[PDB]
């Protein structure tokens, strides 16, 4: 039932609005990706609002969770689109913006694109299902909290524990303890990739005018809040299995 709701509330795919007549410089590609992320963030907010249990959390906590997890949610969904639409041969940012080796280099994000692509390759290896994917994406929204905890920490933990229980019930469909630990390992591995993506994001945000990289209002707001918190060590990534 909660998983059935997850399958039905999955946002529709959105276009990048990519102009292939313009030169494929890093500034043009990154500006297009940033505009696409802004549009996708509006969808994340609308999805989170109807996520079973999310409305029980206070408003300040809902905002904190979305601001800390945005990069993780966007990179996980990118890997799902890449896996579903290309069998993870390309980075499927949108139907009108599919990255091959050429675009990975032109974006000036080559190694970070390889890192995101490795998640897409893990989806092929595991033969990740849509049911597993939707629960795991909810767990990513609930994977980073403030160092001093949320306003309603107990309410958050109840919601998180319940989605971990849904993931454990779902793996039985594909012995199943082995699969559960392969999925929690994959969830944990998102923290390291996101840390690297955020380092690059923050750099382009601080030097936006110089690099000619544009940011939509939704990203300006999220990054302006997130950047000082992440850099000052206020973020607490939650791991299933500590390093």
């Amino acid at each position: 039932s909660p998983v059935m709701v997850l399958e039905n509330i999955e946002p529709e795919i959105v276009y990048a609005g990519y102009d292939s007549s313009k030169p494929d410089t890093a500034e043009n590609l990154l500006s297009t990706l940033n505009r696409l992320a802004g549009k996708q963030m509006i969808q994340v907010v609308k999805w989170a609002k109807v996520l079973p249990g999310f409305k029980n959390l206070p408003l300040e906590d809902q905002i904190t969770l979305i601001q800390y997890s945005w990069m993780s949610l966007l990179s996980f969904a990118l890997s799902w689109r890449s896996y579903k639409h290309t069998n993870s041969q390309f980075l499927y940012f949108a139907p009108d913006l599919v990255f091959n080796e050429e675009k990975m280099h032109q974006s000036a994000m080559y190694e970070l694109c390889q890192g995101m692509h490795q998640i897409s390759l893990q989806f092929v290896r595991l033969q990740l299902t849509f049911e597993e994917y939707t629960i795991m994406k909810v767990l990513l929204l609930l994977s980073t909290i403030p160092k001093d905890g949320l306003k309603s920490q107990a309410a958050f933990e109840e919601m998180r524990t319940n989605y971990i229980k849904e993931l454990r019930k779902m793996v039985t469909k594909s012995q199943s303890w082995q699969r559960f630990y392969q999925l929690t390992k994959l969830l944990d591995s998102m923290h390291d990739l996101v840390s690297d993506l955020l380092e690059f994001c923050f750099y382009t945000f601080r030097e936006s005018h110089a690099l000619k990289v544009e940011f939509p209002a939704m990203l300006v707001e999220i990054i302006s809040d997130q950047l000082p918190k992440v850099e000052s060590g206020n973020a607490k990534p939650l791991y299933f299995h500590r390093k």
Binding site: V45, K46, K49, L59, I63, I66, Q67, M218, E221, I222
Partner: peptide, 10 residues
């Protein structure tokens, strides 16, 4: 209100 506040409370 911020953009996230507006979107979450609408």
């Amino acid at each position: 209100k911020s953009l996230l506040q507006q979107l979450l409370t609408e």
